[PDB]
Write an enzyme that holds these catalytic residues in place. Structure first.
Site, PDB file in Angstrom:
ATOM      1  CG  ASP A 166      -1.695  -1.204   0.950  1.00 61.22           C
ATOM      2  OD1 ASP A 166      -1.819  -2.271   0.381  1.00 61.22           O
ATOM      3  OD2 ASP A 166      -2.666  -1.269   1.977  1.00 61.22           O
ATOM      4  CB  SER A 167       4.372   2.410   0.039  1.00 57.67           C
ATOM      5  OG  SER A 167       4.748   1.384   0.868  1.00 57.67           O
TER       6      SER A 167
END
Ligand code: MG
Ligand code: ZN
Ligand code: ZN
Ligand code: ZN
Ligand code: ZN
Ligand code: ZN
Lengths: 107, 112, 167, 196, 99, 62, 144, 118, 97, 171, 662, 56
Positions: free
Chosen positions: D4-5
């Site tokens: 999710d970065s």
């Protein structure tokens, strides 16, 4: 060993404790149609002698209260006629070591 | 046989969704649950009633009631448990605390 | 072992033979067996301390009038004891000034004199320490002697100790 | 950009992408406990005021309030207030007869900084004077700031790359943002793709 | 000693299933020094596999059971685990399996 | 101690005396202790004892 | 007069009186500004109820009220027990007069500072030998 | 404070769920010299455990960090943990481990005689 | 930052007993308190500058020990004494294991 | 009163003294905190006997400090006072409250209320002393005193003396 | 500055003995008798002598010494007072036990109703544990409504033997709130049993009697269950808070103690000046209620004591129970120093056992390093650097325990470090730190990493370590913890280190594996079609940190030197590693390139997927950590991640809407 | 609940699995005395197959 049919009257049940060392065990016929020891879940129970129990307590440096317990109403305990303070060696199958021997003292 | 059936049920719950847990953990759980001769529940009225030390028992549930019944019965806490040493702030006799480290005088003169 | 409070106890009194729970008649030594409590008079303690100090001086080496005794024990304390020896120096000069007996023969004579009396180890060293002249004086200085020793035996002990006393 | 970065363009951030204003308002009132126990908005001095905060008081004016436009830094006094004490006490060693007051000033947050945007003086319902000081700062996006699409695809900035390090198309267009493919299939967020 | 033999009998069954004379000489084709190396390494890895005393195996067991529960006709899953840990006289789907 | 209004027995007074061996100093105030009157009025208590007993004499005789 | 029981935070190395002392609240320390030596660490920066010992004095009282499981019989007896107290009659009447102060100020929409000033003025002028025969309403009005 | 819809579980907060469901000797005695098991009949493992190794390294590094004499030839090493590991490597640690049996008895194992197989 | 209950449990599972002691004592609250050997209560008056220890009631001055417990533990013990419970802390065993 | 006792002391050796000759550091540190030390449990400890063989147990490393705690067992001569015992001594100081007599390593204070009433203070004479009709009590003067009360703290012992009983006072 | 040195021996608590105060012991340990409900004096500026905040009880101000021990705030533990109650009251937590003991013993002579003359009573006395024996005795004696002054003989029921009994009828006892009422048997007359009567009867219970009931003779007598001398906790237990350092708000316990004192004074005045028995009973009921709510405010069937604001009074039981109590919220878990928390972010360029620590967090958190000859120069340089520059130091602790802040000390000159001193220096690279993600269900959710100081505000960590932490980067925060001693630092890195926890004991398989982009790129890299040209091969080979410097011979020599992806990934695999897995339809020739064959650390065939480098049993991670050790497996994690991430960087991987279209 | 019920269970130096009271839960840990991390799934070759394959 008294194998009754349906029930024991409490007026006759109170004198089932008798003069030592005589011991009276009452078994119901419905509870003894099937031998519980032959069940696959029930493992091998072997009653230990006094010297075996003393050696077991000495080698593990155990007291009586530090052993695993079996109650004096357990169906295998009634099958073996265990008195209070008697130790059974329980040999059972183990999926990690094949054979495993636990011990249980009768309370 | 009750212990074996309890292990079978716990294994069925664990492996119902395909998750695998090693045998010894569930074996330890079912052995603690059956060590007193009967099925001892993991509850406030199960393991928490076994006389395993008042400071351990008050940490789980019924803290003040257990401390009261320990004060009335004059219960002696031997402080062998983890929670007793956690409360008292001393090193619990677990892991690295499960032994004592003592300096050896005979090997100290041997080295030089 | 009981963890009871037991906070009530009688005060340590020399008159009623109460010297405390760690000065009972029977003592457990480092070997574990019961052994009689050792009490020293003023002359015996000086000899014991001097023997210990010369033994320590000998171990360090391998690894009479009151005036010439004071300088000898002073240089012995300087060459044997390190810092914080002011209490030991005061004790040594106290034992030197208040010394009824000089040599170990006199001290051993006093010990064999008082070993047949059958009294407590505390009171025999008090008898050897105090220069009492009267049996009533010994009874009133040491209250434990009442109904414990006869007056004629006490007079004999005092006069023989005064005979054995030197300088 | 894993787990999710997202990789944000640093050059886009430099040109104002997702740069935001942040305002924080501090309220303070001088309350009258009684006759002599009343608070005063003033600039305290170390000579006659006890328990002064270690932050600077030099940015305050004569009324104990900082003028708008002045830059503030961490643990700096923006509202100065003092309360009277009982004279001739003995506490903390540094207590004398000159110390007739203690400091009840309002400092800035220890990590915050910015510019004083607006200082508002008025009275409450009771008629007591009270002030509101607004501090304004930039929140420039950096590593760890949280950004989300309109589809439940949240995540923080893993790293920022400049334009010459970002991938580029044949038209010279670089992304403002790189998100991971692995956020798509398990979450079944097809509408993110159709929206793009 | 009896407890030791009962502890190692299953691993000895595995060892005899693997290090048989037929399998060593025909399948594995081991030599003398290779066989000595196998025996020494099996002994060393066995003695390295024994649980270290002082290990807090109860907390390890509790976490190793609780964590798969957090990743979780007859009842199953979290309610069945709750009905197991709470020893309850009643349950949603009591059942037999009669053979 | 007249400053802190605390009592000190004769046993614990000696542990509090100064290096000059002249005065007993307080633990907290470090002030010279003044002497109480435990014993100066003791005979008075005995006198009070006497002044009770005849006054209680008809009670005991009854 | 009386025990000192006073702690002064003086640097034992600079020996400067009064010392320049910084209370580093963020790091929980009290340090000397000249040498940096700490003097007292682990300093103290809710759980009770606010009570100003200037308006109602040093009065600490708690009332009895209904809980989650409460019988009506036990509450009334405790309320009558609390009411039948003779040592706080002056406190009871001064709290009644303070309640009348709040009732009169709230019926006038006066600000809270007027209520506080009237309450402290009534407290300061209460129990005065020169002020004994005047009516309670006159005291009320003059305090307001 | 704040108003966030980012669901953050309060940890160590099971009391909410707890309130949801509240309704359902012979060989050795005292502290004698028999506590010390003699060396000829020590039944514990001859291998140093991971906890024993960790505490020996910690204790030795703590001593070395407080100017204890180092019994090995340093190769320019300065970190106390690496020096302690070097001492354990060639068995130059002058400590023993008092392994406590559950009955209160103990066995003394020197660090030199323990096998560091891990 | 909260080093909570189940953080303590995970540190137990590692067997890191000294780190667990350090988190609960040298990082949060390390309080030294004196107790007498007679009664396990913490009611020992200790003048460290004068080196005088005394427990009233027991009237002992030579049977005092110092212990390092959390301040929360001291607060627990004082609350128990306020609730008429004795948390008598003793520094030696009385019964065999 | 002089006794010979067997005492056990816990000594915390710093790790800097973990040398090959650690036993002699332990024995030297034993003397410095015992020789002349005052303990209220056992009295003033004067000298350590049996120095050639001293029972030194195996020291336990403290689990957070790193120092080693040894339980050193030794035989030493002690001087423990008691109430109701008669001791000789010499006066070292005098005042209006009383005079301090030095017995052994200990200073017994003789209060003003615990002397015969013939004795009175005289600060004019140098050194100040107590003068009676039959004797004087000055500095460095022999006097026999009965200890009627001794207070023992953890590290100090103070005793209270009287000369009111017959066959006491100067010798 | 710490605490002052004490000559008392330092011991650890081996046993905790529980029990109840005697009324004598409360007065014995008390330093003051509390007599006035007020706390402030008549000037509202000093503490009132005899009040609730008496200075003999201790001081809770930094500038005030305790009157008793003459110590400050941080040294004085507080000292207990006592309140002499006019009438004895029940302890609220012992009401049921008092009622059970009342049913056990006689209400007329204070003797057990059933003795050893009864057969069923003898077996009840034979029970070893106190609780079960007391329960058996109570169940047997609750139905006995007569003292039985004459009982049949045990040997034969023909002659009658007289025990020490009165023969009176024991009433049925039931509770109505805070009092007990007894109804005698009608030949039922009900009356309230006063607490003084119960106390007098409990005083007459013999030592052998309550020992059978489970009560110790020394530590907990039943007569001590009745409160007649209330202990007063010191102001450390009940501190006076400040809302703006001008109000004097007191604790709830202070208010309850004031109410108890008011009720006690009222009862004393009513008893001394004469009152009707209704008024005396009402006042003692009020005192009993105040004591009960002081110890327990949440009582079933009772009104709750309320504050001025209307909130319930927080009793001591409320302060002990729950997750916010002293046990669970302050002892079993607590807030700690030397800890940090920020958002976590992924970093493929970090090692498996490395945490990227922000420079500000590094400058805040410190480690006290003891000065040695081995680090005198480095610690002197760190002290000269100061606290405003990393790496630096914040404090210097001398051998006397004095701590010098390195702020406000540069004007005093440089500090000469001596051996044995401590330097509280900023945490530097390769410092072992505990790193944790709450809820932290298992031991692998709290592991020891090595610090790498980084110039941004987030914790950086490897991607493979996110699976044991159950950590994402959508805003997750993780706690750091810094050990402060060599023992904790050492056992942190020898027990809690990340490589040591690679294989989980939960499922006897690895819990750390190749995940996400590295897994996708390691499948794409090890396809048969994936051939790598020389320049990219050299860049891959240099990206492996422990590469031995030899370029492998290409899988294709002519007409172009081409290396396969399996060949270059085999460089990351250490030598001596053999793995063999057969999938469905997998033979020694692999037409589907499924399965896995690794010989001497060289991939023979098989696309590397989740079955090989994932957290699965029998995979590459498991084999490497069992054959080569944990450190080599952590290096394998780093090498595989570096080479695969470089290849996927210069290859690319996407997904789009067209991938969802059939 | 599981942790609190099992927080005192320890493997001792006699390889017995005991609680804080010293009560034996398992006489050897896991009935085999093995650390769980050092366990791999292996095939028992004797139990499977036919009798002819066993003899071969
Ligand atoms: Mg997340
Ligand atoms: Zn004073
Ligand atoms: Zn300074
Ligand atoms: Zn005590
Ligand atoms: Zn105090
Ligand atoms: Zn009766």
């Amino acid at each position: 060993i008294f194998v009754y049919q349906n029930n024991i009257t409490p007026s006759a049940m109170k004198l089932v404790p008798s003069i030592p060392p005589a011991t009276i065990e009452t078994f119901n016929e419905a509870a003894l149609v099937v031998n519980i020891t032959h069940h696959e879940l029930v493992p091998k129970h072997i009653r230990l002698s006094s010297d075996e129990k003393r050696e077991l307590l000495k080698r593990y440096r155990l007291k009586e209260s530090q052993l695993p317990r079996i109650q004096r109403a357990d169906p295998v305990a009634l099958y073996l006629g265990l008195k209070r303070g008697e130790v059974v060696k329980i040999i059972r199958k183990s999926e990690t070591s094949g054979r495993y021997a636990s011990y249980r003292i009768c309370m | 046989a009750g212990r074996a059936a309890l292990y079978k049920e716990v294994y069925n719950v664990i492996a119902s969704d395909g998750s695998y847990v090693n045998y010894r953990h569930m074996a330890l759980l079912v052995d603690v649950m059956t060590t007193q001769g009967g099925l001892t529940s993991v509850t406030r009225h199960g393991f928490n009633r076994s006389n395993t030390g008042a400071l351990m028992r008050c940490s789980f549930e019924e803290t003040v009631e257990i401390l009261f019944e320990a004060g009335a019965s004059a219960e002696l806490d031997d402080c062998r448990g983890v929670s007793e040493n956690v409360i008292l702030g001393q090193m619990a006799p677990i892991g690295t605390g499960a032994f004592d480290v003592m300096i050896d005088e005979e090997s100290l003169v041997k080295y030089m | 072992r009981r963890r009871r409070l037991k906070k009530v106890e009688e005060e340590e009194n020399a008159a009623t033979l109460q010297l405390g729970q760690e000065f009972q008649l029977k003592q457990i030594n480092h070997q574990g067996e019961e052994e009689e409590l050792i009490a020293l008079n003023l002359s015996e303690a000086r000899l014991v301390i001097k023997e210990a100090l010369v033994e320590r001086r000998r171990a360090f080496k391998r690894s009479e009038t009151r005036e010439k005794e004071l300088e000898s024990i002073d240089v012995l304390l300087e060459q044997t004891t390190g810092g914080n020896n002011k209490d030991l120096k005061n004790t040594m000069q106290y034992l030197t000034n208040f010394s009824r007996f000089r040599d170990q023969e006199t001290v051993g004579a006093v010990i064999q004199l008082l070993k047949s009396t059958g009294l407590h180890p505390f009171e025999v060293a008090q008898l050897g320490s105090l220069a009492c002249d009267t049996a009533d004086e010994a009874k009133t200085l040491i209250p434990s002697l009442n109904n414990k020793i006869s007056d004629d035996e006490l007079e004999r002990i005092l006069k023989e100790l005064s005979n054995l006393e030197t300088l | 950009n894993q787990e999710d970065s997202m990789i944000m363009n640093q050059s886009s951030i430099d040109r104002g992408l997702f740069r935001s204003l942040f305002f924080r308002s501090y309220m303070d009132q001088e309350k009258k406990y009684g006759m002599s126990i009343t608070e005063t908005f003033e600039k305290p001095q170390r000579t006659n005021t006890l328990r002064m905060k270690h932050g600077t008081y030099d940015k305050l004016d004569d009324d104990g309030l900082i003028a708008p436009g002045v830059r503030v830094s961490g643990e700096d006094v923006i509202i100065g207030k003092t309360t009277p004490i009982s004279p001739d006490e003995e506490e903390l060693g540094q207590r004398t007869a000159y110390h007739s007051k203690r400091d009840a000033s309002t400092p800035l947050r220890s990590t915050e900084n910015g510019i004083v945007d607006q200082v508002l003086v008025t009275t409450n319902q009771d008629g007591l004077k009270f002030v509101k000081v607004r501090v304004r700062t930039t929140k420039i996006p950096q590593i760890g700031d949280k950004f989300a699409s309109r589809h439940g695809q949240k995540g923080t900035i893993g790293i920022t790359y400049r334009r010459e390090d970002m991938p580029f198309t044949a038209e010279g267009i670089v992304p403002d943002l790189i998100i991971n493919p692995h956020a798509i299939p398990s979450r079944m967020t097809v509408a993110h793709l159709i929206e793009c | 000693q009896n407890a030791q033999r009962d502890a190692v009998t299953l691993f000895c069954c595995l060892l005899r299933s693997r290090l048989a004379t037929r399998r060593v000489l025909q399948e594995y084709r081991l030599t003398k020094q290779a066989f000595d190396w196998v025996l020494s390494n099996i002994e060393a890895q066995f003695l390295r596999s024994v649980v270290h005393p002082g290990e807090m195996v109860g907390v390890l067991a509790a976490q190793s059971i609780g964590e798969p529960a957090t990743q979780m006709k007859v009842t199953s899953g979290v309610p069945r685990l709750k009905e197991i840990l709470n020893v309850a006289k009643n349950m949603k789907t009591p059942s037999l399996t009669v053979y | 101690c007249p400053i802190c209004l605390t009592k000190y027995t004769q046993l614990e007074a000696v542990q509090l005396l100064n290096f000059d061996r002249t005065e007993f100093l307080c633990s907290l105030c470090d002030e010279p202790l003044v002497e109480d009157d435990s014993g100066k009025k003791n005979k008075e208590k005995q006198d009070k004892l006497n002044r009770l007993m005849d006054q209680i004499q008809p009670i005991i005789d009854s | 007069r009386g025990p000192n029981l006073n702690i002064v935070l003086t640097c034992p190395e600079c020996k400067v009186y009064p010392p320049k002392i910084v209370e580093r609240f963020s790091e929980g320390d009290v340090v000397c500004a000249l040498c940096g030596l700490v003097l007292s660490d682990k300093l103290v920066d809710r759980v009770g109820e606010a009570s100003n010992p200037l308006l109602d004095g040093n009065n600490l009282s708690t009332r009895i009220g209904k809980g989650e499981t409460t019988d009506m019989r036990f509450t009334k007896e405790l309320n009558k027990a609390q009411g039948k107290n003779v040592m706080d009659k002056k406190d009871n009447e001064v709290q009644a007069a303070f309640a009348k102060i709040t009732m009169l100020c709230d019926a006038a929409e006066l600000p809270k500072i007027v209520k506080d000033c009237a309450k402290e003025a009534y407290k300061l002028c209460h129990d005065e030998k020169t002020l004994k025969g005047k009516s309670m309403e006159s005291i009320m009005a003059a305090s307001i | 404070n704040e108003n966030f819809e980012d669901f953050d579980v309060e940890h160590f907060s099971d009391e909410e769920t707890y309130e949801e469901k509240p309704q359902f000797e012979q060989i050795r005695r005292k502290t004698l010299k028999e506590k010390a098991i003699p060396k000829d009949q020590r039944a514990t493992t001859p291998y140093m455990t991971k906890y024993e190794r960790a505490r020996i390294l910690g204790t030795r590094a703590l001593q070395i960090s407080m100017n204890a004499p180092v019994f090995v030839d340093l190769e320019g090493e300065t970190d106390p943990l690496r020096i302690a590991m070097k001492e354990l490597a060639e068995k130059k640690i002058p400590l023993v481990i008092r392994r406590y049996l559950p009955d209160g008895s103990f066995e003394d194992w020197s660090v030199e005689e323990l096998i560091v197989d891990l | 930052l909260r080093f909570g209950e189940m953080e303590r449990d995970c540190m137990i599972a590692h067997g890191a007993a000294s780190f667990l002691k350090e988190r609960l004592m040298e990082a949060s609250d390390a309080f030294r308190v004196h107790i007498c050997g007679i009664c396990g209560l913490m009611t020992v008056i200790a003048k460290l500058n004068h080196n005088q220890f005394e427990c009233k009631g027991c009237d002992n001055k030579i049977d005092i020990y110092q212990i390092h417990i959390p301040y929360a533990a001291k607060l627990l013990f004082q609350e128990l004494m306020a609730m008429n419970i004795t948390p008598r802390l003793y520094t030696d065993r009385s019964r065999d294991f | 009163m002089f006794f010979i006792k067997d005492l056990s002391l816990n000594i915390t050796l710093h790790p800097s003294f973990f040398g090959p000759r650690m036993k002699q550091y332990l024995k030297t540190k034993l003397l410095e905190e015992v020789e002349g030390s005052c303990t209220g449990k056992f009295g003033y400890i004067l000298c350590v006997l049996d120095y050639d063989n001293i029972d030194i147990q195996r020291g336990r490393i403290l689990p957070t400090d790193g120092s080693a705690e040894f339980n050193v067992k030794y035989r030493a001569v002690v001087f423990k006072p008691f109430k109701g015992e008669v001791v000789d001594g010499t006066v070292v100081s005098c005042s209006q409250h009383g005079f301090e007599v030095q017995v052994g390593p200990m200073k017994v204070f003789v209060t003003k209320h615990l002397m015969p009433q013939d004795l009175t203070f005289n600060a004019g004479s140098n050194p100040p002393s107590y003068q009676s009709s039959e004797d004087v009590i000055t500095i460095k003067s022999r006097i026999r005193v009965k200890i009627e009360g001794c207070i023992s703290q953890v590290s100090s012992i103070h005793a209270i003396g009287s000369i009111k009983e017959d066959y006491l006072g100067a010798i | 500055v710490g605490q002052q040195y004490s000559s008392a021996p330092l011991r650890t608590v081996k046993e905790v003995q529980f029990g109840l105060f005697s009324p004598e012991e409360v007065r014995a340990i008390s330093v003051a008798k509390i007599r006035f409900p007020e706390t402030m004096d008549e000037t509202q500026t000093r503490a009132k002598i005899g009040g609730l905040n008496d200075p003999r009880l201790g001081s809770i101000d930094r500038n005030l010494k305790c009157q008793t021990c003459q110590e400050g705030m941080n040294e004085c533990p507080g000292h207990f007072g006592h309140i002499d109650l006019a009438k004895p009251v029940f302890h609220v937590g012992f009401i049921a036990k008092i009622k059970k003991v009342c049913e056990c013993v006689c209400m007329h002579c204070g003797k057990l109703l059933l003795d050893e003359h009864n057969e069923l009573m003898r077996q009840a006395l034979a029970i070893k544990d106190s609780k079960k024996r007391f329960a058996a005795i109570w169940t047997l004696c609750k139905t006995k409504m007569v003292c039985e002054t004459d009982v049949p003989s045990e040997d034969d029921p023909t002659q009658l033997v007289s025990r020490g009994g009165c023969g009176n009828t024991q009433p049925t006892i039931r509770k109505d709130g805070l009092k007990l009422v007894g109804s005698w048997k009608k030949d039922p007359e009900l009356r309230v049993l006063s607490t003084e009567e119960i106390l007098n009867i409990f005083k007459h219970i013999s030592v052998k009697d309550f020992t059978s009931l489970g009560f110790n003779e020394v530590f907990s007598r039943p007569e001590w269950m009745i409160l007649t001398c209330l202990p007063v906790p010191p102001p450390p237990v009940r501190p006076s808070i400040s809302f703006n350092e001008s109000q004097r708000g007191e604790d709830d316990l202070t208010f309850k103690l004031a109410d108890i004192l008011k009720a006690n004074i009222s009862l004393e005045t009513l008893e001394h000046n004469g009152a009707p028995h209704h008024a005396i009973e009402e006042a003692e009921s009020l005192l009993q209620f105040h004591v009960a709510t002081y110890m327990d405010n949440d009582i079933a069937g009772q009104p709750q004591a309320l504050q001025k604001s209307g909130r319930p009074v927080k009793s001591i039981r409320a302060r002990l129970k729950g997750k916010e109590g002293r046990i669970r919220g302050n002892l079993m878990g607590k807030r700690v120093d030397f800890s940090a928390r920020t958002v976590i972010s992924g970093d493929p360029n970090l090692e498996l056992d490395q945490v990227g620590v922000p420079k500000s967090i590094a400058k805040t958190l410190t480690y006290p390093e003891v000065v040695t000859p081995y680090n005198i120069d480095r610690l002197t340089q760190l002290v000269r650097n100061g606290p405003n520059e990393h790496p630096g130091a914040k404090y210097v602790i001398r051998d006397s325990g004095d701590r010098i802040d390195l702020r406000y000390s540069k004007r005093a000159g440089d500090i000469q470090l001596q051996y044995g001193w401590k330097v509280e220096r900023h945490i530097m690279d390769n410092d072992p730190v505990l790193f944790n993600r709450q809820p932290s269900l298992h031991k692998m959710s709290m592991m020891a990493h090595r610090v790498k100081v980084i110039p941004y505000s987030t914790f950086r960590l490897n991607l493979s370590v996110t699976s044991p932490y159950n950590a994402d980067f959508d805003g997750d925060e993780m706690n750091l913890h810094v050990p402060q001693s060599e023992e904790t630092r050492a056992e942190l890195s020898q027990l809690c280190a990340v490589p040591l926890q690679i294989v989980s004991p939960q499922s006897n398989k690895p819990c750390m594996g190749i995940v996400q982009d590295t897994l996708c790129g390691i499948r794409k890299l090890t396809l048969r079609d994936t051939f790598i040209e020389l320049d990219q091969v050299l860049n891959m080979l240099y990206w492996v940190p422990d590469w031995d410097g030899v370029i492998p011979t290409p899988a294709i020599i002519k007409p172009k030197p081409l290396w396969s992806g399996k060949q270059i990934l085999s460089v990351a695999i250490p030598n001596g590693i053999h793995l063999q897995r057969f999938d469905e339809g997998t033979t020694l020739l692999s037409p589907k390139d499924n399965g896995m064959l690794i010989i001497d650390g060289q991939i023979i065939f098989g696309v590397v997927e989740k079955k090989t480098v994932g957290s699965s049993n029998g995979g590459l991670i498991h084999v490497v950590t069992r054959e080569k050790g944990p450190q080599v497996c952590a290096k394998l994690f780093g090498n595989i991640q570096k080479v695969v991430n470089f290849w996927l960087l210069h290859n690319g991987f996407s997904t789009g809407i067209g991938d969802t279209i059939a | 609940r599981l942790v609190k019920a099992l927080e005192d269970i320890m493997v001792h130096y006699d390889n017995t699995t005991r609680n804080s009271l010293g009560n034996v839960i398992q006489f050897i840990y896991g009935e085999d005395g093995m650390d769980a991390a050092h366990i791999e799934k292996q095939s028992l070759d004797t139990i499977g197959g036919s009798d002819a394959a066993f003899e071969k």
